[PDB]
Amino acid sequence: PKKTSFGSLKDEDRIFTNLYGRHDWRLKGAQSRGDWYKTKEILLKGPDWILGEVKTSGLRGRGGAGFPTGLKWSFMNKPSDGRPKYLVVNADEGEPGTCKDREIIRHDPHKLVEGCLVGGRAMGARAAYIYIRGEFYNEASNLQVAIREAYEAGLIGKNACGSGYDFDVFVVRGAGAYICGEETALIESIEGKQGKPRLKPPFPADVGVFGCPTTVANVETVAVSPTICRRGGAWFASFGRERNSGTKLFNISGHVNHPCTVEEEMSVPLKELIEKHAGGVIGGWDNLLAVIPGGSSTPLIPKSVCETVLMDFDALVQAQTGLGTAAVIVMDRSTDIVKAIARLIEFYKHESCGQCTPCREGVDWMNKVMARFVKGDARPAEIDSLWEISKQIEGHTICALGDGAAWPVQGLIRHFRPELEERMQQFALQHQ
């Protein structure tokens, strides 16, 4: 009735069986691994059944939102209105520490296109625009090879999978931006204009790409969608805590012996995951200083929090952080925490699209202030000023990049203020 000891998943329930590219990633290998099997029956079941089984799965947005993917995808169950319906798969993967999208695309692309096909059918979309980032040129070419194989096999195109539905997938390359990862900015960049995000009184379900309805979904979420249809929401709901189901991927990087990727069951203990899959923190677990749970946007937590925390949405939310993209970055006692965070703010300043004032001016201001903090040329009152500034841009920006840049500062301040104090005192008496 309850699998309290969540984690230690087995190979049978793993989705991306070809994660490390140890099997044929072409159509032949994907069909061998169990892809494109009874797809027509999924198509013939009807979009309501596809949406309904997603709610039973309790799938949450694996892109940094954690939204109830079933509820979100239900927004195009509305009848047709003359305008075409479009699906969009986010594949930017610009958040630091995030590598999962790269691996699925270049090692199991056929799952992705099938995900667009079943996803489009559920939401009634006409075509899927996979927005792969510009850097992933080899990945994009690998993705297109699978698309051509699917087109020749008759899985996609006119009468997709022999079910009457006509679905097409256009893989659109990026031109280099982290803000393109944002859903509305991605919708913007597809349209050909500058990649600034658009405000939302409206929503992509009503007004979106070319003005037609759209829904930006992460690569992982759509990729696991067909297997959810095959194995059921009940099978998917079995894993993970309540409201925390599924087997989210994990990108472990930083001061680990063997940084890697693993598709571990959700709500896994953080210590357990690092110990076996990654190999443990360099210099032993006691050498840990701080950990980035789910990417740069997610605030850091110290080792004391790291002692026992389940890797999921709710457990991290009560731990003053978020799951985000499950990008676990560890930082040992040899890591300059202030320098590392300042680099993250530097990245955010170099990636802000400059549209709204709080993100255009606040992030740059926070960059300059944090630069002084690294050198120590400041005063203790500046820490509080940095806190107020980070709150001023929080929730006042068009997209969640401003909140995505304010959280690391808030995370650093509330957990390493004595380190900041010591550095400033060190600067003070040195320059006497």
Ligand X SMILES: Cc1cc2nc3c(=O)[nH]c(=O)nc-3n(C[C@H](O)[C@H](O)[C@H](O)COP(=O)(O)O)c2cc1C
Query: Which partner, ligand X, ligand SF4, another protein, none, binds residue 172 by CB below 5 to 8 Å per kind?
Result: another protein
Q: Give me the sign of the Cα torsion angle 241, 243, 244, 246.
A: positive
Per CB under 6 A, 299 contacts ligand SF4: no
Name which position in 2, 175, 284, 431 contacts another protein (CB under 8 A): 175
The answer to the question of whether 260 is labelled as a binding residue is no
Give the one entry of ligand X, another protein, ligand SF4, none that residue 218 binds, where binding means its C-beta sits below a cut-off of 5 to 8 angstroms depending on kind. ligand X
Tell me if 254 is assigned to a ligand binding site. no
Q: Is 218 annotated as a binding residue?
A: yes
Other residues' Cβ atoms within 10 Å of the Cβ of residue 341: 25
- Under rule CB under 6 A, which residues in 200-219 are in contact with ligand X? 216-218
The token pair at 335 is 């890591």
Q: How far apart are CA 123 and CA 214, in angstroms?
A: 9
- 208-247: string of b/e by CB count within 10 Å (b at 16+)? bbeebbbbbbbbbbbbbbbbbbebebeebbebbbeebbbb
User: Which residues are CB-neighbours of 26 under 8 A, at least 6 positions away?
Assistant: 110, 145, 146, 149
- Is 80 annotated as belonging to a binding site? no
Q: Which one of residues 28, 41, 71, 170 is an interface residue with another protein (CB under 8 A)?
A: 170
Ligand-binding annotation for 63, yes or no, is: yes
Q: Is 306 annotated as a binding residue?
A: no
Which residue has the closest beta carbon to ligand SF4?
A: 359
Q: Using CB under 6 A, count the residues that bind ligand X.
A: 24
Among the listed residues 229, 252, 359, 370, the single contact to ligand SF4 using CB under 6 A: 359
- CA–CA distance, 54 with 313 (Å, rounded to integer): 18
Is 64 annotated among the ligand-binding residues? yes
Q: Is 189 in the site for ligand SF4 (CB under 6 A)?
A: no
Residue from 47, 64, 97, 120 in contact with ligand X (CB under 6 A): 64
CA distance 349 to 342: 10
Which range, of 58-66, 166-174, 259-267, 306-314, touches another protein by CB under 8 A?
166-174
Q: Is residue 221 a contact point for ligand X (CB under 6 A)?
A: yes
Of 27, 21, 73, 81, give the one whose Cα is nearest residue 51. 73
- Minimum distance of ligand X from residue 253's CB (angstroms): 16
Q: Is there binding between residue 79 and another protein (CB under 8 A)?
A: no
Quick check: 274 and 280 in contact, CB under 8 A?
yes
Residue ranges in 379-408 that form contacts with ligand X under rule CB under 6 A: 399-401, 404
95 belongs to an annotated ligand binding site: yes
Question: Is 196 near another protein (CB under 8 A)?
Answer: yes
Position 390 contacts ligand SF4 (CB under 6 A): no
Q: Contacting another protein (CB under 8 A), which of 118, 123, 160, 177?
A: 177
Query: Does the annotation flag 192 for ligand binding?
Result: no
Would you list which residues are annotated within the binding site?
62-65, 67, 72, 90, 93-95, 101, 181, 183, 216, 218, 221, 325, 352-356, 359-360, 397, 399, 402
Would you list which residues are annotated within the binding site for NADH?
63-64, 67, 72, 93-95, 183, 325
Binding residues for ligand SF4 (CB under 6 A)? 179, 196-197, 352-356, 359-360, 397-399, 401-402
Binding residues for another protein (CB under 8 A)? 83-84, 134, 170, 172-177, 188-196, 198-199, 201-202, 206-208, 210-212, 353, 355
Binding residues for ligand X (CB under 6 A)? 61-65, 67, 69, 90, 92-95, 179, 181-183, 216-218, 221, 399-401, 404
